[PDB]
What does this fold into?
Amino acid sequence: PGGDMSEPVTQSTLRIVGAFWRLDASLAFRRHFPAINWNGSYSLFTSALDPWYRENVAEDYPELRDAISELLQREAGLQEIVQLVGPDALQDAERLVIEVGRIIREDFLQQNAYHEVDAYCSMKKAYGIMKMILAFYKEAEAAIKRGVSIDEILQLPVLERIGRARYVSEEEFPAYFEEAMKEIQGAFKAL
Amino acid sequence: PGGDMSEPVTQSTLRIVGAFWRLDASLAFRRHFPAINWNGSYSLFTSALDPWYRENVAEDYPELRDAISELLQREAGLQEIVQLVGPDALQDAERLVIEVGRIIREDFLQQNAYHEVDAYCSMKKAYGIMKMILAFYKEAEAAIKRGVSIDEILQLPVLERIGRARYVSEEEFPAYFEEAMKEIQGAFKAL
Amino acid sequence: RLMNNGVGKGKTREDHKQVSDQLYSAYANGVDIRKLVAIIGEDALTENDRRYLQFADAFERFFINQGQQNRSIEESLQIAWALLSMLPQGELKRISKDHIGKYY
Amino acid sequence: RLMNNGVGKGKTREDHKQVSDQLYSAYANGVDIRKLVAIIGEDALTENDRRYLQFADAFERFFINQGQQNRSIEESLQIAWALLSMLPQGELKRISKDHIGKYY
Amino acid sequence: RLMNNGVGKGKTREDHKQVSDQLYSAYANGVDIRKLVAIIGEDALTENDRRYLQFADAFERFFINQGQQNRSIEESLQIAWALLSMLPQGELKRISKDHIGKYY
Amino acid sequence: SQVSPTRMNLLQRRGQLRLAQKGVDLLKKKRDALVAEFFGLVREAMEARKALDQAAKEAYAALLLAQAFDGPEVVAGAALGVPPLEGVEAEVENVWGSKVPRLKATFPDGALLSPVGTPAYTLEASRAFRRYAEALIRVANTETRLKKIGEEIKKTTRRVNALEQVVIPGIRAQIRFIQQVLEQREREDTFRLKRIKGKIEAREAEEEGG
It folds into this structure.
């Protein structure tokens, strides 16, 4: 009834049940949904899910997800320093990440409950989206190390394809995803 | 007791009120009766006093006065940036505004109320010095627009003349009015 | 709350759904750099980000200000696109490709 | 709160009432300056300041300190005038002309 | 707080004392660098200290991870040592020379 | 516009300090490094330049031997024969806030270029340029770096100051304000609650009856 999670009736829920999600307030004023703080939240159930996931979904999924949290929860690591001296003077393995992740919440964390489609997904679809980004991180990491810069990479057309991306439906989805699977390796080595 | 707007007695005289005229501790240190804080006010009749205004005072009053609020409004907004940089690395034409504003205080604040010059002051005497300063702005505005340094207007004695603005006994007010009106558009037309 | 009802579907122009969240989100995005600016410098922003701050003052000033002068659903919208105009395309992800060009 | 009575001629001496504010107004312009050393430069200042600087020191450890020796109201004002002395006489707005040459 | 009357030279292994105040104070020194490297790049780290970055990685990745592996006080002290070898010697000046002369 | 409210925020705004305080703790010992590197530049600057100027000038006035106006001649007769204009390389290096370029401008610039032997003083004098031009470049490029990094050094310590004693003692000053009010809240809580007990007992003292 406040916002102070300190208040008893709320808190008593935690530490009586597991799987806590918190829904940030200042997130949402902007415009996302059903955005949550994942720097508040925490589930417990997440290890005993591993069997079913392995088999049903993909055999390498939990590894591929932890690397997403690898950026995602680490990203605050830089966030703070941004607000201590701007994005200025954070150089390039620096501003790599910032931006990667920028997109990670701009596109992997915001659905709707009103967009006509794209508001429900299967794992295997979602799973897909998620593999792309990893790649993009990987090759970018090797982009700057090689001698070029993110600066233009951002302003590549191929970023926006990763952008709008979620919108296509399932039917197309396989092949959509396959098309970017070509587009990557060429669109790095070239430039 | 807080001197803080918080206790109920301040909140409750705020819904059965007309206007507000909040003071402020901080100014009180650097002595300015009244510690009226021109960022802490609001009338609620300057939308219904205009009839008697532009009929008796002048006709140059419902406008010319307000265009001074815009001055002093903007004096705030710059101050931050001044202390964020200095009264230095600005655009030159700006550093005008900072001591225009200064004068809106030198001769439009204080007025002890204990010195036999304050103790009734008419709209006429008011409006009087209010309008002089308005001019002064535009005049310098052209001076430095041409390219003279903003410095240059500052040493001019015509400011010194205006610093006695509130030191003219009431009767002989039109004595400095027009007189110095010309000393302004006159002397300052040297450069 | 009740808004996803009665809008656009022969009830307003089809552009509405995507209008709002974009224009919305821009401004959100907007004032945000109002802060980061006032700390680091007077600017140090990139020429991408410049365009953002330029729209700040704008948004508030033109559009949200209004006379007694009434408006219509359509004339409003017009203006609306005009403030989306200033940001360059490829920055508006929240709108979809057709609608954007439809009335750019 | 008072200090408008128990002042001037026929009571005290004609100059409390005057030199009152002067010093006040003097000290003020010190402190402002002492900020701006600390955030821009030590010769990025006018020299119209170097006197108020040193006037602030005089008013500082010269004047305020008084040891466990006494002073007397005369002696006070006496050295009050010394306090002023450093400043040029074209800046001392708050003082009637007659006293200005009656002391220095 | 109470742990002095723990591990001892004639109680359970001698050198432990000093291992403890090693890896601690060593550690914190490196966790700064891991942040400040974000502001100046890595092209401005001296040699000795550049290694104090790498220390952290091997410490964090392997040393405090321990999955389901059980260990023991003796096997554990060894590991530690090894990692300390990564930074330059003759420097870990909390620990006494003797021990280093028997382990590395 | 708004005074920060009355609960929730204690923890958040304390962690404002945790971030800030630790951030500004360390921002200094960020900066300590750059102050070291300033010294590296500081030694190096004038060394040879001052040296090879001085035998440059040797010949400069000496070469007037009867060349008092064949300086003129020689510059006419021989000049524009080793590159004398253009060769600026604008350089990027760490620059904070709104960016800044530095640079070295180096391109060929001093030797013989006259056809054959021709006067002697000429050749010798032009040889001084070798020793001049070149040397004048070192101080042109070290002394400008030095002052720029100077500003930075200062500018950093500037923030240091503000942060170190503007933010901290203020946002501190907010936090207390939360505390005392969060606390005052509950004094009344109890006092109010107290009275409830009084009722229960007074009330049931006459459910003893009789």
